[PDB]
Design a protein around this nucleic acid. Structure first.
Length: 69
RNA sequence: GGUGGUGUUUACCAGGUCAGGUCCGAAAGGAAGCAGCCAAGGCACUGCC
């Protein structure tokens, strides 16, 4: 379950904008989205790092389950 | 090296365009711009000079 699937799932429209700002490598192996990338991803999706961190946290939640069922 | 070709590679770090999103604006409309793409660079093979 990579960020590519979690994408299929201005309310959420912005939660998309964020991913539509990532790169294939990022959307495929999130454990590489440190500071620098974030600062890119945020300003890229007109958001803010905190926003990204939010979505990042969301993915994890929606992720762990897959790895537990 | 120059200038071509082909394969490969490259998140941001004053190239271009810009979905999506953001920004300013009562509006009309402006602005910056991620991914993508183009271009460009790198690693090689290669033609020519």
């Amino acid at each position: 379950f990579d960020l590519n699937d979690f994408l299929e799932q201005k309310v959420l429209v912005r939660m998309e904008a964020i991913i539509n700002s990532m790169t294939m490598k990022e959307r495929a192996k999130p454990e590489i989205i440190k500071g620098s990338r974030k600062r890119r991803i945020a300003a890229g999706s007109g958001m803010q790092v905190q926003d990204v961190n939010r979505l990042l946290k969301q993915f994890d939640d929606m992720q762990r389950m897959m790895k537990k069922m």
